[PDB]
Ligand binder design. Structure first.
Ligand SMILES: [Mg+2]
Ligand SMILES: [Zn+2]
Ligand SMILES: [Zn+2]
Ligand SMILES: [Zn+2]
Lengths: 56, 49, 34, 49, 65, 56, 49, 53, 53, 56, 45, 279
């Protein structure tokens, strides 16, 4: 995570089995591939940090 | 199967392809201290413990 | 006359190991993968 | 329907590596905290953060 | 470590063939590419299974219980 | 460096990622098993009270 | 007035059958035990080949 | 018990099901990769004989 | 089971053993019988004894 | 700065002893209630002080 | 008491608490634990 | 002051309460209403995961030496400033006891548990009018025998006497008080096998003696004045039941026993040969 596009805010969609799935285009900013890379998720705990995510 | 994913075949998984066994082994041991306090292998109850 | 001085950890299958000369059918007896 | 391209196709030795996903999925909301510093502990095994 | 029942890709039952195959190989001195075709394993998906199986269970059975 | 400038946090998850050509650019697929764990404290208002009653 | 328990639980995410349990004494004649647990891992979505 | 393959490959009564149509490529449903000549490099199907060239 | 195979290993091979199921409509999906999980109206029971002699 | 730093304060005369939380003990298995280093060095200071008090 | 089995002598043992961890017929010091009797259920999936 | 904390659901209050610790959430909850009583639980294994007060008490210690970045005009004075307070502490006689007995039990080829009981058995008595010196051996000679037997390994007095020459008398008086020291603070079977191995015999000859010696003990035959001897005769009883050359003369020096006690002890055996028939 060495630039601001390595942390973007997404919208949850709850799915079965245990991987995070993301669209393919978003993959080049994160600089990820699917050979076992893991990515972290942070949930905002307030009504206002939510809007910080969705809007910035 | 992009970016190094792959599609595997669900039927072949059902028939055994790449199944494996896993064996995790736990050790435990009871210690003596001064022949005064000495751990013990027993099944406890919520009444004495 | 001869004196104990301590113990030498042994490498497996070395000249001084019980297995060094054991035979296959014997390795199974000892439960060692040939 | 026939695919319009033709597929390269035949067997190939594949090995199953050690990194199963179930040993890696990890979540936490409000678990325990370290003692000295009182932040969440580390490590999936102990419900870290 | 023993004789898969059905071929992975294919489903064809193959686990009733190991002894017949070993014996074909051993008493009649066929080669595998012919032993196999005689058991009816025509698709190379099924040929893979028998041709390439490794009968480790024999080595396990040596350990006296 | 290790405790003030950055630290470990609650309300997070980490797992392996996969691709999905069927999620929008901004969605992320979250395993149901994880969504059951992470959590978001919502405030009971007139506009959701029954719906929140259902969840409870 | 008696005892605080020190049992060893299975991992928070594992399961499967106890495979074998053996009981011996360490060098110092202290009883100790080794439990082995067996699981079957079937290939899954995030697994590495 | 009674079940179907769609639920586990064990309840499946069929092994490989062959399937093929139009063995000459008359419908042009596939385009053949080749280096010099397609007709040489792609072997005729068995069925290629039940339809006239 | 004191063989050299694990149970779920053996149990998995038993699942793939193809059983005669010509007259299978005369059975019922085990979630349609009202038995305490299985009865002759919805399932067949086999058994296997083997001993190395 | 004569309110916040006299030079004569670079020479320690009293010593401030941090409370336990700065140096907590690891109460482990009812007798391995191990002690933090800062407790030790403090003991070792306090001894080496206690001695020298006599030796005069 | 509960059944046990020597590791090598392979004889059912049935010792109790505060008995020696030791095999009859060979003072072998390793015992297995004489698998359970209740049935156990697997799926052939 | 009483400085004490107790938890109880102030909205059930019914009990000394029914609460559970949900560790993985860092909570304690009233098992009835599920009100969470207190949170931010602090870990309990990670603490010592990153890592002797029964002996070293409260006067602590720390090994002080020389680092990479120090010349010998500072290093050796750390060896010359550490030496000023070794007599306010009797602890030299505390640690040098342990170090000595550690040097002993370890050189004696003993289980590291006995080492502790002797590291205890010193520390518990550690000064008494009964002790009042008494050569400072006999304790480290008995606190070991204590620490040995108290750790369920019994060794003969001669055996320790081999380790430490205690005049065999300073031992005895020191033992009696010592045992009673703990009684106020509050088993010859062990000899059969250690002997067989000393003769390098298979298990059955040793296996049998446990029956024979117990059976020879169980009915009659007080027999022996320090039953050490009448242990060995069971081997001699049973070795002759087998046919393995351990001729009496070889027995003696190997186990450092009188030969006379053997044959006369074997008198009560060449006549009692009736009831030891297991097979
Ligand atoms: Mg990668
Ligand atoms: Zn096939
Ligand atoms: Zn039924
Ligand atoms: Zn309550």
């Amino acid at each position: 995570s060495l630039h601001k596009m390595s942390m973007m805010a997404h919208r949850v969609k709850v799915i079965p089995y245990s991987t995070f799935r993301l669209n393919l285009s978003v993959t080049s900013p994160y600089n990820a591939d699917f050979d076992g890379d893991e990515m972290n998720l942070h949930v905002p705990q307030s009504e206002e940090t939510r809007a910080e995510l969705s809007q910035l | 199967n992009q970016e190094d994913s792959m599609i595997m075949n669900q039927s072949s998984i059902d028939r055994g392809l790449f199944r494996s066994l896993f064996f995790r082994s736990y050790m435990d041991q009871e210690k003596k201290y001064g022949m005064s306090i000495t751990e013990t292998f027993e099944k406890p109850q919520r009444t004495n413990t | 006359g001869k004196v104990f001085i301590g113990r030498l950890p042994i490498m497996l299958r070395s000249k001084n190991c019980y297995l060094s000369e054991a035979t296959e059918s014997d390795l199974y007896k000892l439960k060692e993968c040939p | 329907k026939k695919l319009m391209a033709q597929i390269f196709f035949g067997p190939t030795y594949y090995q199953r590596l050690r990194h199963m996903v179930d040993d890696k999925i990890h979540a936490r909301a409000r678990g325990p905290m370290q003692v000295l510093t009182r932040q969440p502990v580390e490590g999936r095994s102990r419900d870290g953060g | 470590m023993i004789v898969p029942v059905r071929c992975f890709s294919c489903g064809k039952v193959v686990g009733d063939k190991w002894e017949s195959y070993l014996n074909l190989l051993q008493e009649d001195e066929l080669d595998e590419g012919t032993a196999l075709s005689r058991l009816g394993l025509k698709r190379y998906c099924c040929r893979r299974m028998i041709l390439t199986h490794v009968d480790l269970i024999e080595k396990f059975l040596r350990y006296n219980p | 460096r290790g405790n003030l400038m950055g630290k470990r946090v609650d309300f997070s998850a980490r797992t392996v990622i996969s691709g999905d050509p069927n999620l929008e650019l901004d969605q992320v697929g979250v395993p149901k098993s994880i969504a059951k764990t992470l959590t978001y404290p919502e405030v009971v208002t007139p506009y959701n009270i029954d719906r929140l009653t259902q969840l409870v | 007035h008696s005892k605080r328990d020190a049992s060893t639980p299975l991992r928070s995410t594992e399961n499967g059958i106890v495979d074998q349990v053996l009981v011996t004494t360490n060098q110092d004649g202290l009883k100790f035990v080794k439990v082995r647990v067996r699981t079957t891992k079937i290939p899954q979505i995030g697994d590495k080949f | 018990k009674k079940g179907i393959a769609k639920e586990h490959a064990k309840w499946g009564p069929a092994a490989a099901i062959e399937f093929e149509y139009d063995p000459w490529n008359k419908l042009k449903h596939t385009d053949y990769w080749y280096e010099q000549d397609s007709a040489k490099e792609w072997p005729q199907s068995k069925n290629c004989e039940y339809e006239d060239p | 089971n004191t063989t050299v195979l694990a149970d779920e290993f053996i149990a998995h091979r038993l699942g793939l053993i193809p059983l005669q199921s010509m007259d299978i409509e005369q059975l019922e999906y085990s979630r349609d019988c009202f038995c305490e999980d299985h009865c002759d109206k919805c399932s067949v029971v086999l058994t296997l004894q083997a001993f190395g002699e | 700065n004569e309110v916040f730093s006299r030079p004569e304060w670079m020479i320690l005369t009293c010593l401030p002893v941090p409370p336990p939380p700065v140096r907590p003990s690891i109460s482990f298995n009812e007798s391995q209630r191990g002690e933090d280093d800062l407790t030790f060095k403090l003991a070792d200071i306090l001894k080496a002080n206690i001695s020298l008090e006599t030796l005069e | 008491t509960l059944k046990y089995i020597c590791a090598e002598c392979s004889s059912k043992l049935s010792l109790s608490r505060t008995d020696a961890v030791r095999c009859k017929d060979c003072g072998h010091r390793i015992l297995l634990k004489a698998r359970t009797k209740r049935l156990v259920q697997f799926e052939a999936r | 002051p009483n400085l004490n904390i107790v938890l109880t659901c102030p909205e059930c209050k019914v009990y000394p309460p029914k609460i559970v610790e949900r560790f993985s959430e860092g909570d304690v909850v009233c098992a009835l209403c599920g009100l969470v009583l207190s949170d931010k639980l602090v870990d309990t294994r990670s603490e010592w995961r990153t890592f002797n007060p029964l002996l070293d008490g409260n006067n602590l210690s720390t090994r002080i030496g020389k680092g990479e970045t120090t010349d010998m005009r500072f290093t050796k004075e750390l060896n010359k400033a550490q030496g000023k307070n070794v007599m306010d502490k009797k602890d030299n006689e505390v640690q040098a006891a342990f170090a000595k007995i550690t040097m002993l039990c370890d050189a004696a080829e003993l289980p590291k548990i006995v080492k502790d009981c002797a590291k205890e058995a010193y520390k518990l008595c550690h000064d008494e009018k009964t002790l009042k010196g008494k050569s400072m051996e006999s304790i480290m000679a008995a606190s070991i025998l204590i620490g040995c037997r108290r750790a369920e390994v019994a060794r003969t007095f001669k055996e320790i006497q081999s380790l430490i020459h205690v005049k065999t008398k300073e031992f005895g008086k020191t033992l009696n008080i010592m045992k009673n020291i703990l009684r106020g603070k509050s088993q010859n079977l062990t000899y059969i096998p250690r002997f067989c191995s000393h003769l390098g015999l298979p298990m059955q000859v040793t296996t049998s003696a446990e029956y024979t010696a117990k059976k020879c003990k169980e009915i009659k035959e007080i027999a022996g004045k320090s039953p050490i001897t009448i242990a060995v005769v069971s081997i001699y009883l049973n070795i002759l039941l087998f046919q393995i050359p351990i001729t009496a003369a070889k027995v003696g020096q190997t186990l450092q026993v009188t030969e006379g006690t053997i044959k006369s002890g074997y008198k009560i055996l060449y006549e009692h040969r009736d009831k030891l028939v297991d097979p």
